[PDB]
Design an enzyme around this catalytic site. Structure first.
Site, PDB file in Angstrom:
ATOM      1  N   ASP A  77       0.763  -1.243   0.000  1.00 22.89           N
ATOM      2  CA  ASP A  77       0.000   0.000   0.000  1.00 22.89           C
ATOM      3  C   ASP A  77       0.798   1.302   0.000  1.00 22.89           C
ATOM      4  OD1 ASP A  77      -2.213   1.389   2.583  1.00 22.89           O
ATOM      5  OD2 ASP A  77      -1.925   1.972   0.479  1.00 22.89           O
TER       6      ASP A  77
ATOM      7  N   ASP B  50      -2.733   5.495  -4.875  1.00 19.45           N
ATOM      8  CA  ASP B  50      -2.859   4.467  -3.853  1.00 19.45           C
ATOM      9  C   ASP B  50      -2.990   3.010  -4.298  1.00 19.45           C
ATOM     10  OD1 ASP B  50      -4.987   4.539  -0.889  1.00 19.45           O
ATOM     11  OD2 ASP B  50      -3.177   3.377  -1.405  1.00 19.45           O
TER      12      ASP B  50
END
Length: 329
Positions: free
Chosen positions: A31, A215
């Site tokens: 992430d 993201d």
């Protein structure tokens, strides 16, 4: 070094890492939106069903483990985890690094019972790390083994390789054309300026500019509640509790959505953002674009997740604080 990723329903992309001696294996999502590393802990009460359904790190079975014990809570957009810090050797894509990570002892059934992965490996900057824990990528760079201070993401279509992360560079095999970079607004966050968002024929969104958080940990492309309301109204989509739907028969008819980034237009077709499950007018089909209000200082901001990355191979350049995009192959 590359990490092989598994694609679960086009919403969860995860690879494997090994922690401890002997190695204890874990499925984790990489992430760019967060900076901490964490996996479920053997010390997690089995009253947390999510802990019953995931691999648990047991420190008493690792001879390389180093105790710390500092308490930490990690707050994500869709959920929270809490536990304590620990140190041990982590194996990632062939590279071995000593790393401080979180052992989670509180992991809510919703949403973690729905998680295919066990934990998360933050790829963000140390400025966003909770408890000021050195991020795993900074630790790898400190070894001075990578040929470049950059990492790249390739997310495949659902099919059924699920995807791939390259530490140290990019894989020409999964992209074509050349990269087009956008400088980071600031170090510490993989966020970039977005000049505008257009739907069909009417740049009725993000006029005057806005922010875009690249993201890899986000399943979808997200915008603030106000922005998404407009975008959806324009699409003829109906809102539900957790998403937006459209009658399936009209999924293929939905207009293109474009994202102006660094002087280049990144365009998605309806096939790119709608989960075309069927074509019946008696069924509803979800869209891979959601409403998500990301709190300051990082937000408000749009979030470019898997829906976007599937279309564009993404390179995160730490040496030049920039992000590069190229047509995924």
């Amino acid at each position: 070094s590359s990490v092989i990723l598994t694609n679960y329903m086009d919403t969860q992309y995860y690879g494997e890492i090994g922690i401890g001696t002997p190695p204890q294996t874990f499925k984790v999502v990489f992430d760019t939106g967060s900076s901490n590393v964490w996996v479920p802990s053997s010390k997690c009460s089995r009253l947390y069903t999510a802990c019953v359904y995931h691999k648990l790190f047991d420190a008493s079975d690792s001879s390389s483990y180093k105790h710390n014990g500092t308490e930490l809570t990690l707050r994500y957009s869709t959920g929270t985890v809490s536990g304590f810090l620990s140190q041990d050797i982590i194996t990632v894509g062939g590279i071995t690094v000593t790393q401080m990570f979180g052992e989670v002892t509180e992991m809510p059934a919703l949403p973690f019972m729905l998680a295919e992965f066990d934990g998360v490996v933050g790829m963000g900057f140390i400025e966003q790390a909770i408890g000021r824990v050195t991020p795993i990528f900074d630790n790898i760079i400190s070894q001075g083994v990578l040929k470049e201070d950059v990492f790249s993401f390739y997310y495949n279509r659902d099919s059924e390789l699920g995807g791939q992360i390259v530490l140290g560079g990019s894989d020409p095999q999964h992209y074509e054309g050349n990269f087009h970079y956008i400088n980071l607004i600031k170090t510490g966050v993989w966020q970039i300026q977005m000049k505008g968002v257009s739907v069909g024929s009417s740049t009725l969104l993000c006029e005057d500019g806005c922010l875009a958080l690249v993201d890899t940990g986000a399943s979808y492309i997200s915008g603030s509640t106000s922005s998404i309301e407009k975008l959806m109204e324009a699409l003829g989509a109906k809102k539900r509790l957790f998403d937006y739907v459209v009658k399936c028969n009209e999924g293929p008819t939905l207009p293109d959505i474009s994202f102006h980034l660094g002087g280049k237009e990144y365009t998605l077709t309806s096939a790119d953002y709608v989960f075309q499950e069927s074509y019946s007018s008696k069924k509803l089909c979800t869209l891979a674009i959601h409403a998500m209000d990301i709190p300051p200082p990082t937000g408000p901001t749009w979030a470019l997740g898997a829906t976007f990355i599937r279309k564009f191979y993404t390179e995160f350049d730490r040496r030049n604080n920039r992000i590069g995009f190229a047509l995924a192959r």
